[PDB]
């Protein structure tokens, strides 16, 4: 294994380093507004050194944006794919690339066998080429790497199954900035090349000037270069035809033949190509191509030809094909051009580029880093969509976990097709895959489309719950008794965090009575491959409840009241009819644990009761009366864990890690950003703040303090936010119920203030996979120092680190030494002129979840001050795991459960803490005679600060007949393991394995 901590990779372009030494001047470059007047030596070209031009037709299809998936399918996409099948069949020389397999599967399954075979013929002979072959073209900022791999797998599994093709070239023309997570996953999924477009105009100029627009993109920690993937960055402002022929859009627009009810903004229309004008038209176009070609190191030129939902009308196919063919015929026949031009595919471009490389014609630079935050012009930084529609951003992480749990729980067995496990899991995977779209999770779609995504994800959650509860009943019911009704609800799921009782009062109360129903079985699932102890809670009808395991061993518990917050002043009310029972569940690796909740007369031996302090109320049978008092400071400690001090407004002010350590200042504060009155308006995409954020007036808010042996919390009702700090004996958990209400042109930010001597350095993660060093640049505007916070952010000095872990992707920064900040929600009256044609006025209450880890790092082995990566501690990693993959809770639905067992997976290996089974998925239905199960293993890298059994997934299921290391999609064998043991994986590596069973 490589050391990813001590050694810094040597790369030609390191983006943090490049950023430091770039000026980012927005100079008028001429016809190429953000570049320069490109010049080439015409004697560069001759009969032995021709320019080879591939013109690659394409159609950018959004699976939701202005219209829903189905609306676009019926209005646009089904016509584009009908016409592609017809025109390509009829015209053997015509080419077309297709990215979105969600639309292609929708279309293909509706074809007659004749058309299906015709479709197969144009794929087989390379006329229609799939690029990436993901379900969608995903967002790269907010997306979790697990969901990027899921949507890739869903698209490529469809292509392999129905078209017997696996793309090895990626096409990502529209995501709003680019992540090195994409090459990481692509290169471990068999890919050889990828293409990107939306990178900062100053980065385009800078790389273009050095012909570094093609590069071997490696991971920021990769010393060896084994992660390297060949990347083509397109050089200009758009993927549209005016911005793809060459540097001058006024010329390129004349070669978009559909613009004869569309026109050219530069007011020179395209002209039909004739024998009268082909010599002149060809001279104009080839001059553009030769300028584009000066930006690249080979004599092979990519000329994309398309735009949004193009190639819809058969006459657009005619007018583009016939005019380009007249140009190609003229140019190829005229030796003075020294060009060979033709319709081509993306793979054809890359193949030719690598042929040129192998022949010594070019050697390509190496690059590490990311391409956030994107600006398409001036100060228009796209950091807005890191936060837009945060409700659905949170929903993404919930559904991610439920799909993982449902696939893992159901994987243990083969299921009868009558159970419809495969149908439910396929629905769940596709709704979540669809939401990865760059107008889904981004929050950049119209309100009615956001509603479609929400309803799709809600059906997906329901599908996962049905699979999970059937699976748990099977895993924990004696095989001699197990006799399932596949339509029956054996368990209901209990989720304290989604949507959140403050968002929807939906959690079921377990109603117990010595009369009516004395006891209830509950079951916890642990998707992680190690023993886990976590506090769990349930709603109960009485406070006099005792916890046992199934062996009747008592379990210490705490009962708290059920609190909710109300307006008219924001104040808490307490239930008289339901209570929280809280206890520590101990659950095996990838396993289940059964407990029993039992009512009594009065206070049981092993259940404690929390005190309640209301600073500024009956609780039925709750045996401790609520104490009252004036606003004042408070200090709480749970177990041996940290001591937290709170202001008289119920906001953290300091953390003491240990009894004999200092009171470290850590202040939470809420602030607000506004919208510019004059010039560019913030919208779904753009963050254009009218200066630094302003404190929110908190007034005299009501602070609720609940104190118990197992769990304590401070809650305050602030304007727009019910803020809560929960303590369970480690890093505290922060919950914000965010209701931005009617606060038009407002962004609400949560800031932490410390004396940590961070300076201009902070760390943010990419797709929950890796932490990247950021440097705050005063030469860039505020919105440019905003980065994606998909799962966490941290600041540190020589001695101290503060890490904030998130349960949802949000936008954030460190805008000053010792600060972190993270946006909670945004309400924007104005459109930001990127085509959505509305503001963001559909806000709804969302419960945001966080863990806050203050740590001493002076005895941690940290990377060199030159390393572009950071790494979490054990504590911060486990805290992230708590948020993303908590224990699942199941309440047995019926009065009695015959055959009930107490534990599943007691014999499962407890793997090293830095190892995860990201995916466990059964690949075969019951009717297959060799059953197959896919595993994705990810090993992170944790900082060694000076403090388990081997996991072989090949042997997790019995009767293993063989085991293959595969691509992450499971679609190709990479290494036969004669041994049928999976070798363990290196730090920051991800490997896939498929086990076969007889
Ligand atoms: O404007 C940015 C994006 C949109 O959000 C949609 O994805 C559409 O494809 C156009 N594209 C540009
Ligand atoms: Zn798009």
Curated annotation (Swiss-Prot):
Keyword Disulfide bond applies: yes
Recorded catalytic activity of this chain's protein: N(4)-{beta-D-GlcNAc-(1->2)-alpha-D-Man-(1->3)-[alpha-D-Man-(1->3)-[alpha-D-Man-(1->6)]-alpha-D-Man-(1->6)]-beta-D-Man-(1->4)-beta-D-GlcNAc-(1->4)-beta-D-GlcNAc}-L-asparaginyl-[protein] + 2 H2O = 2 alpha-D-mannopyranose + an N(4)-{beta-D-GlcNAc-(1->2)-alpha-D-Man-(1->3)-[alpha-D-Man-(1->6)]-beta-D-Man-(1->4)-beta-D-GlcNAc-(1->4)-beta-D-GlcNAc}-L-asparaginyl-[protein]
Name used for this protein in its record: Alpha-mannosidase 2
Single GO term (MF): mannosyl-oligosaccharide 1,3-1,6-alpha-mannosidase activity
Positions in the Lumenal compartment: 1-998
Protein family: Belongs to the glycosyl hydrolase 38 family.
InterPro entries assigned to the protein according to its UniProt record, in alphabetical order: AManII_C, Gal_mutarotase_sf_dom, Glyco_hydro/deAcase_b/a-brl, Glyco_hydro_38_C, Glyco_hydro_38_cen, Glyco_hydro_38_cen_sf, Glyco_hydro_38_N, Glyco_hydro_38_N_sf
Keyword terms, alphabetized: Disulfide bond, Glycosidase, Golgi apparatus, Hydrolase, Membrane, Metal-binding, Signal-anchor, Transmembrane, Transmembrane helix, Zinc
Record: residues binding Zn(2+): 60, 62, 174, 438
Recorded GO CC terms: endoplasmic reticulum; Golgi membrane; Golgi stack
Functional pathway: Protein modification; protein glycosylation
């Amino acid at each position: 294994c490589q050391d990813v901590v001590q050694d810094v990779p040597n790369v030609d372009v390191q983006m943090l380093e490049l950023y430091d030494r770039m000026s980012f001047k927005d100079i008028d470059g001429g016809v190429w507004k953000q570049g320069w007047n490109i010049k080439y030596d015409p004697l560069k070209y001759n009969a032995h050194h021709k320019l080879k031009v591939f013109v690659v037709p394409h159609s950018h299809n959004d699976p939701g944006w202005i219209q829903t998936f189905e609306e676009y399918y019926q209005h646009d996409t089904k016509h584009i794919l009908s016409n592609a099948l017809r025109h390509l069949h009829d015209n053997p020389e015509m080419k077309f690339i297709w990215a979105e397999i969600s639309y292609f599967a929708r279309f293909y399954h509706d074809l007659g066998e004749n058309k299906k075979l015709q479709m197969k013929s144009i794929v087989k002979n390379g006329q229609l080429e799939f690029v990436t072959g993901g379900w969608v073209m995903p967002d790269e900022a907010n997306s979790h790497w697990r969901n990027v791999l899921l949507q890739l797998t869903e698209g490529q599994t469809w292509l392999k199954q129905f078209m017997n093709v696996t793309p090895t070239a990626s096409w990502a023309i529209d995501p709003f900035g680019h992540s090195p997570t994409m090459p990481y996953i692509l290169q471990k999924s068999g890919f050889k090349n990828m293409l990107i477009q939306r990178t900062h105009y100053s980065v385009k100029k800078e790389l273009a000037q050095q012909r570094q627009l093609e590069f071997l993109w490696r991971q920021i920690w990769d010393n060896k270069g084994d992660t390297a993937l060949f990347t083509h960055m397109m050089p200009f402002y758009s993927y549209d035809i005016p911005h793809t022929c060459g540097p001058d859009p006024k010329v390129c627009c004349q070669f978009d033949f559909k613009r004869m009810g569309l026109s050219c903004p530069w007011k020179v229309p395209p002209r039909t190509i004739s024998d009268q004008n082909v010599a002149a038209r060809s001279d104009l176009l080839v001059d553009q191509w030769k300028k584009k070609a000066e930006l690249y190191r080979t004599n092979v030129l990519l000329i994309p030809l398309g735009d949004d939902f193009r190639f819809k009308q058969n006459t657009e196919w005619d007018v583009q094909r016939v005019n380009y063919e007249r140009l190609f015929e003229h140019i190829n026949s005229q030796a003075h051009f020294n060009v060979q031009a033709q319709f081509g595919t993306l793979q054809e471009y890359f193949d030719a580029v690598h042929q040129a490389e192998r022949a010594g014609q070019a050697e390509f630079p190496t690059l590490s880093g990311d391409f956030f935050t994107y600006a398409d012009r001036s100060d228009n930084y796209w950091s807005g969509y890191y936060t837009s529609r945060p409700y659905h951003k949170r929903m993404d992480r919930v559904l991610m976990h439920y799909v993982r749990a449902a696939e893992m729980l159901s994987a243990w067995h083969s299921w009868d097709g009558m159970a419809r496990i495969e149908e439910r899991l396929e629905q769940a995977r596709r709704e979540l895959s669809l939401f990865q779209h760059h107008d889904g999770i981004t929050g950049t779609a119209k309100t009615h489309v956001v509603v479609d995504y929400e309803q799709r994800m809600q059906e997906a959650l329901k599908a996962c719950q049905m699979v999970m509860q059937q699976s748990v009943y099977r895993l924990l019911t004696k095989p001699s008794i197990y006799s399932p009704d596949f339509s029956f609800s054996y368990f209901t799921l209990d989720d304290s965090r989604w949507p959140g009782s403050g968002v929807e009062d939906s959690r079921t109360t377990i109603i117990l009575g010595e009369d009516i129903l004395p006891s209830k079985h509950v079951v916890m699932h642990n998707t992680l491959p190690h023993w886990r102890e976590q506090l769990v809670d349930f709603y109960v009808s009485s406070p006099f409840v005792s916890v046992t395991d199934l062996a009747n061993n008592p379990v210490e518990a705490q009962v708290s009241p059920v609190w909710s917050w109300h307006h008219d002043t924001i104040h808490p009310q307490g239930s008289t009819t339901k209570y929280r029972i809280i206890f520590k569940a101990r659950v095996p690796p990838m396993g289940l644990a059964t407990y029993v909740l039992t009512i009594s007369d009065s206070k049981p031996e092993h259940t404690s009761y929390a005190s309640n302090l209301l600073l500024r109320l009956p609780l039925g049978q709750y045996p401790e009366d609520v104490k009252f008092g004036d606003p004042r400071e408070i200090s709480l400690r749970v177990g041996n864990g940290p001591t937290l001090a709170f202001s008289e407004q119920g906001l953290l002010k300091s953390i003491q890690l240990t009894q004999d350590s200092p009171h470290v200042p850590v202040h939470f504060k809420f602030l607000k950003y506004g919208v510019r009155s004059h010039g560019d308006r913030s919208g779904a995409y753009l963050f254009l703040p009218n200066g630094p954020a302003s404190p929110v007036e908190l007034g005299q808010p009501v602070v609720l303090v609940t104190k118990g042996k197992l769990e304590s919390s401070v809650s305050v009702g602030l304007p727009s936010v019910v803020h809560q700090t929960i303590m369970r004996g480690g890093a505290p958990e922060i919950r914000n119920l965010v209701d931005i209400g009617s606060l038009d042109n407002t962004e609400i930010v949560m800031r932490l203030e410390t004396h940590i001597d961070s300076g201009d350095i902070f760390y943010t993660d990419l797709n929950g996979l890796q932490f990247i060093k950021r440097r705050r640049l005063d030469k860039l505007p505020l919105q440019a120092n905003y980065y994606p916070i998909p799962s966490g952010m941290f600041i540190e000095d020589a001695n101290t680190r503060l890490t904030l872990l998130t349960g949802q992707p949000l936008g954030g920064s460190s805008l000053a030494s010792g600060e972190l900040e993270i946006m909670q929600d945004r309400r924007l009256a104005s459109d930001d002129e990127r085509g959505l044609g509305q503001g963001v006025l559909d806000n709804k209450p969302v419960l945001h979840i966080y863990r806050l880890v203050l740590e001493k790092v002076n005895n941690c082995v940290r990377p060199s001050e030159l390393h572009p990566a950071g790494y979490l501690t054990s504590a911060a990693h486990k805290a992230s795991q708590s948020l993303l993959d908590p224990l699942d809770k199941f309440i047995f639905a019926e009065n009695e459960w015959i055959g009930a067992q107490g534990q599943f997976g007691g014999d499962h290996p407890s793997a090293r803490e830095d190892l995860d089974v990201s995916v466990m998925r059964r690949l075969t239905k019951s009717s297959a005679k060799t059953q197959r199960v896919g595993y994705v293993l990810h090993r992170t890298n944790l900082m060694q600060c000076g403090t388990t059994q081997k996991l072989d997934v090949c042997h997790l299921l019995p009767n293993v007949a063989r085991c293959e290391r595969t691509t992450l999609t499971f679609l190709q064998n990479l290494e036969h393991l004669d041994g049928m043991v999976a070798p363990e994986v290196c730090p920051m590596e991800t490997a896939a394995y498929v086990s076969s069973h007889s």
